[PDB]
Amino acid sequence: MLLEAIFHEAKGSYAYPISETQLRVRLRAKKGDVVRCEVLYADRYASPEEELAHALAGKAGSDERFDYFEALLECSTKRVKYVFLLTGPQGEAVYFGETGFSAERSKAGVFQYAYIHRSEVFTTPEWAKEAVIYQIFPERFANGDPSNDPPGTEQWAKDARPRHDSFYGGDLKGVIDRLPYLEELGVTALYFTPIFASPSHHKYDTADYLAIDPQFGDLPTFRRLVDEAHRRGIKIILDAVFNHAGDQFFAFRDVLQKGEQSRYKDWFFIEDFPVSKTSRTNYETFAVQVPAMPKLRTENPEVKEYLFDVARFWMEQGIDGWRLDVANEVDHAFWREFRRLVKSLNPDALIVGEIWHDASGWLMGDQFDSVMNYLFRESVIRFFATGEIHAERFDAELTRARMLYPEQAAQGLWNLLDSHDTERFLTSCGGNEAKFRLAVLFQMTYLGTPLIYYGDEIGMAGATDPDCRRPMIWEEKEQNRGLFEFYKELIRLRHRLASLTRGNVRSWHADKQANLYAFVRTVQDQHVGVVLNNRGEKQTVLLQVPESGGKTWLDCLTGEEVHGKQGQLKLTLRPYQGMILWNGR
């Protein structure tokens, strides 16, 4: 074996708890070097005269370079000392522990998980596990109250192509009216990009955090939206732009009015007074120079309690979550205490982050629940849309990503096709429905929470902003009801097929030439296997039957695939057809 490729921390993504009693321990080796990884383990205090309990780390994923094995340690003392035995393809056998590697056990060492605390088990809202979230971008979703409209609202037309400064007048009241469509579609939560009082089109330079911006409505309308949505089973997650405030923020104005005489000067990062709001910044801002967005000193206790009062307030209104913006430019301390705050006021409130790099620091269980899955988007783009990667490069990029974080976070990343900053997915797939449909057929079966961007269900299009932010299409006969009914098909299967929400994922077939990838989600005895034919051509596959069970499997989209003969399944997939083969458990 190449021993200087094998790796484990006894923390992080590689050893963590799933109850006070149970340690998931994950181990990574270079691809092909190890064929059995076994875990021999006992209580941290147990005497040398006890032989260790055993746990086989089965192989759970493989990537570009690596091979990933994963086992579950029963630990009734909530304290475990373990050692890995690693047998290679010829039959070498080696031990790995903290002191290193030996053919003799006791020279390799032990890894220990000193104690499993009850608080320190990453716990996630039950509801979040079967959610389908719908990103409403509020200015563009529905104009339900024309008295709202900003001076210069343009007219709601499918033909209309938005400028960066266009207004169409969408609002909270219009969402209140569109709620039987959201219930039709079957979503379970609604995510608003920031709706809070700001003097600009884009509400990221927050002027007031306790008022809904006048374009979209007011507190009584927000409260009724909450109360109308909750009746239909939809939750309200809200953007929080706590990293920076807007230049009209009460405090920032006071510093502007008074320099150092200001009570609020240290709420911000000022270089020289007087605070020259001009083009040339002399305070820290949202990224380089952005005068309308000074950076808040979240480390300062006064700033910290203000935004905490802001959280409290919106939770009084009854929102079920936050999706946090530039979460990584504010300190870990703030998010740990934010977590505690939000989670005592509402245990089921969801906390998503937005971080465009490995989010592990945040996804330990003590700051956030999940983060926006950019790695899902970069893959689904490259596989279905651009056709820049082939089925095995997909499997490697899926599997690499899956093993970045503990499972409890991984089963909850918001798996998006696009957003209000990216071009639309259909337009990434240059109008081809079948490339799109297959990428949504995956998205509704893979591990994560599906996040639909407004209008995709019904076939919208658009290059990047502002053509992603194009007025929604409400007219039946100018909307793709064929697609709509297909999101409803898939959502209905997500919502009644427990593997899809709660199961794990194993790769089942990757073929570089045919470009067919296939995966199996399983919980407790149930397996549903999604076969995806990503080529323009009718092809055919022998797939070897999955580990746990299947003699007859039903296509949940159409009808029976009883063709399990001699450990192989033979299917012939028409161009771009996925298939969802449930087993009956």
Segments in 165-320 forming alpha helices (H) = 172-185, 219-232, 250-258, 301-317
Q: Is 205 a catalytic residue?
A: no
At 181, list the tokens: 């469509």
Peptide bond preceding 125 in cis form (omega within 30 of 0):
no
The residue type of 298 is T
Please tell me whether residue 66 adopts helix, strand or coil conformation.
strand
State whether CATH 3.20.20.80 applies to domain 122-242+298-502. yes
Q: 243-297: which CATH number, 3.40.30.10, 3.90.400.10, 3.40.50.300, 3.30.470.10?
A: 3.90.400.10
Q: Is 117 annotated as a binding residue?
A: no
**Annotated catalytic residue within 38, 213, 247, 325:** 325
**Annotated catalytic residue within 354, 358, 392, 555:** 354
Q: Is 309 annotated as a binding residue?
A: no
Q: Please enumerate in sequence order all residues whose Cβ is within 8 A of that of 176, keeping only pairs 6 or more positions apart, or say none.
A: 144, 221, 224, 225, 228
What are φ and ψ of residue 25, in 5° steps? Answer: -130, 120
Q: Is 205 annotated as a binding residue?
A: no
The answer to whether residues 127 and 110 touch, using CB atoms and an 8 Å cutoff, is no
Separation between Cα atoms, residue 417 and residue 421, nearest integer Å: 12
Q: Is 555 annotated as a binding residue?
A: no
Separation between Cα atoms, residue 415 and residue 402, nearest integer Å: 12
Separation between Cα atoms, residue 517 and residue 532, nearest integer Å: 6
Q: Is 171 annotated as a binding residue?
A: yes
Start-end of CATH 3.90.400.10 domains in the chain: 243-297
Q: Is 143 annotated as a binding residue?
A: yes
Start-end of CATH 2.60.40.10 domains in the chain: 1-121
Separation between Cα atoms, residue 295 and residue 307, nearest integer Å: 13
The answer to whether residues 489 and 476 touch, using CB atoms and an 8 Å cutoff, is no
Q: 503-585: which CATH number, 3.40.50.1950, 3.40.228.10, 3.40.50.1100, 2.60.40.1180?
A: 2.60.40.1180
Q: Is 392 a catalytic residue?
A: no
End-to-end CA distance of the chain: 39
Start-end of CATH 2.60.40.1180 domains in the chain: 503-585
CA 527-533-538 angle, to 5 degrees, is 130
At 140, list the tokens: 């563009």
Separation between Cα atoms, residue 6 and residue 28, nearest integer Å: 6
The architecture of the domain spanning 1-121 is Sandwich (2.60)
Start-end of CATH 3.20.20.80 domains in the chain: 122-242+298-502
Separation between Cα atoms, residue 203 and residue 314, nearest integer Å: 17
- Rounded CA Rg of the chain: 26
Q: Is 421 annotated as a binding residue?
A: yes
Q: How many angstroms separate the Cα of 19 from the Cα of each of 16, 44, 339, 438, 504?
A: 9, 17, 20, 36, 17
Residues 332/338/340/343 CA torsion (nearest 10 deg) = -130
Q: Quick count: other Cβ atoms within 10 Å of Cβ 333?
A: 12
At 244, list the tokens: 């920076």
Separation between Cα atoms, residue 459 and residue 63, nearest integer Å: 34
- Report helix angle 481-496 to 172-185, nearest 10: 70
The residue type of 199 is P
Q: Is 395 annotated as a binding residue?
A: no
CA 60-523-502 angle, to 5 degrees, is 90
CA atoms within 13 A on the CB side of 92: 13
For this PDB entry, the determination method is X-ray
The answer to whether residues 483 and 437 touch, using CB atoms and an 8 Å cutoff, is yes
State this model's resolution in angstroms.
2.6
* Beta strand ranges found along 114-185 (DSSP E): 133-136
At 122, list the tokens: 């990453």
Q: Is 254 annotated as a binding residue?
A: no
H or E element, residue 80: strand 80-87
The answer to whether residues 429 and 536 touch, using CB atoms and an 8 Å cutoff, is no
Pairing of strands 526-533, 578-582: antiparallel
